[PDB]
Amino acid sequence: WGYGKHNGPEHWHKDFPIAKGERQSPVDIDTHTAKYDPSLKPLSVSYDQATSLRILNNGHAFNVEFDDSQDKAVLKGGPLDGTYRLIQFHFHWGSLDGQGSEHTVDKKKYAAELCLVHWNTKYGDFGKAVQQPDGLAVLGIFLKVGSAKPGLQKVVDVLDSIKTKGKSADFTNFDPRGLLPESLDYWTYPGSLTTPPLLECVTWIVLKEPISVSSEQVLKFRKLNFNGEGEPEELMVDNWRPAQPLKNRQIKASF
């Protein structure tokens, strides 16, 4: 599976039938239709104790992994029940500034989308959680092109070392707090993973407020390779899945 003409998103349903399931992601956030829910509690992000370990190029994006053996970096509150532990963060970008986000707002697409993945500690591990309807919580943040984002610079400078598929690099002491907008206002809906196996185990939390990155930061992303080292070079560009049918589901807003 991949993002090319022969293995792209239009093809995943052959191997992964849930691809046409009932609570697939991403989706278009219609702001006029989303329902203000007064019963939604503020998000609670506790990442001061986060421990980053490494960054790796898995052939479809680059995951920054964190030590999830203890409640060091957690998400709670909002529409969530229980404590969710931060396991990794990755991005989805495009070949041009006009595209790259997965989730769209009123049909508007952003240069990129940041996903912070967390799993419910009631399930013991990540593997058990993907098996549950309330097993994951993904904090989605959009990226627009403007001024640079200081907190993103350490990730950008290490890309060179993980250019191709299978590469990894020690990546300790990275603080994800540096990637958050000022406002924690959000939209939430029941969805799924946006890459195979597309398990319908996620409570999506999409931030209203986007973060701005400079043109050059985003450019360093576009230099990654889908291919392994020693193979023809395929730029990691447009690793995003098109919007899926909402299908009855409701998107609630915290504002």
**Catalytic sites, residue numbers:** 60
- Taking the least distance from each CB to Zn ion, the nearer of 80 and 115 is 115
User: CB of residue 32 vs Zn ion: minimum separation in angstroms?
Assistant: 26
Please tell me whether residue 111 binds Zn ion under the rule CB under 5 A: no
User: CB of residue 245 vs Zn ion: minimum separation in angstroms?
Assistant: 19
User: CB of residue 89 vs Zn ion: minimum separation in angstroms?
Assistant: 9
- Taking the least distance from each CB to Zn ion, the nearer of 9 and 229 is 9
Within 13 A of 50's CA, how many CA atoms are on the CB side? 28
Residue 72: name the closest of 53, 94, 96, 90 by CA: 53
- Taking the least distance from each CB to Zn ion, the nearer of 83 and 88 is 88
Report d(CA 79, CA 64) in Å as an integer: 25
DSSP E strands: which ranges in 12-155?
A: 28-29, 35-36, 43-46, 52-57, 62-66, 74-77, 84-93, 104-105, 112-120, 136-145
**Chain residues 115-134 in contact with Zn ion, contact rule CB under 5 A:** 115
Only segment of 37-45, 109-117, 119-127, 230-238 that touches Zn ion (CB under 5 A): 109-117
Beta carbons of 42 and 184 less than 8 angstroms apart: yes
**Chain residues 178-237 in contact with Zn ion, contact rule CB under 5 A:** none
- Taking the least distance from each CB to Zn ion, the nearer of 192 and 254 is 192
The torsion of the CA quartet 124, 200, 204, 235, rounded to 10 degrees, works out to 100
Only segment of 26-34, 36-44, 107-115, 175-183 that touches Zn ion (CB under 5 A): 107-115
User: CB of residue 72 vs Zn ion: minimum separation in angstroms?
Assistant: 22
Please tell me whether residue 74 binds Zn ion under the rule CB under 5 A: no
DSSP E strands: which ranges in the chain?
A: 28-29, 35-36, 43-46, 52-57, 62-66, 74-77, 84-93, 104-105, 112-120, 136-145, 168-170, 186-191, 202-207, 211-213, 252-253
Question: CB nearest Zn ion: which residue?
Answer: 115
Number of residues located near Zn ion, criterion CB under 5 A = 1
Binding site for Zn ion (CB under 5 A): 115
